[PDB]
């Protein structure tokens, strides 16, 4: 029913997750009801073989902050089948964050949420700091992006 969900193809597809970011990465699998499920994390510069399936949807996040990362230069990874026996690579990288978002990341990394509103900054930035990245926000945006260019 949710458009962004894995399909139960039951068709094995071997993938290699390759973390080419400086972040500890959390692979996130969107299950058949479109709910996110975590898998074990990947240290920077580490690769790992995974047994996945045709049509299964994956996202990748900073394991500690949930910032979004790219996989093969886009936000969603969906394997097809292994071509002539070769593993499918999912190359995970850092996006070029806006300077504002990167600043929000660094301030969130240094200040407890309960203290955001004690910071002496333009007050619109309080809600910006509190609007933490998260998978469901991105799923909403990605879904309406999909229907928008679908029409």
């Amino acid at each position: 029913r949710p458009v962004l969900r894995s399909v139960n193809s039951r068709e094995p597809s071997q993938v290699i997750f390759c973390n080419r970011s400086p972040r500890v990465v959390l692979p996130v699998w969107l299950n058949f009801d479109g709910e996110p499920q975590p898998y074990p994390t990947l240290p920077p510069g580490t690769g790992r073989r995974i047994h996945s399936y045709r049509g299964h949807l994956w996202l990748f996040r900073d394991a500690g902050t949930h910032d979004g990362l790219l996989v093969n230069q886009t936000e969603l990874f969906v394997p097809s089948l292994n071509v002539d026996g070769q593993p499918i690579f999912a190359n995970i990288t850092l996006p070029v964050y806006t300077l504002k978002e990167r600043c929000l990341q660094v301030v969130r990394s240094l200040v407890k949420p309960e203290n955001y509103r004690r910071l002496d900054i333009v007050r619109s930035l309080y809600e910006d700091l509190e609007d933490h990245p998260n998978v469901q926000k991105d799923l909403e945006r990605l879904t309406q992006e999909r229907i928008a260019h679908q029409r």
Binding site: C18, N19, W29, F32, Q37, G47, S52, Y53
Partner: peptide
């Protein structure tokens, strides 16, 4: 049918990528 979720192979070893 049963749903088949992704899984990590037991003989898998992390490597430098």
């Amino acid at each position: 049918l049963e749903t088949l979720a992704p899984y990590i192979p037991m003989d898998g070893e992390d490597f430098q990528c």
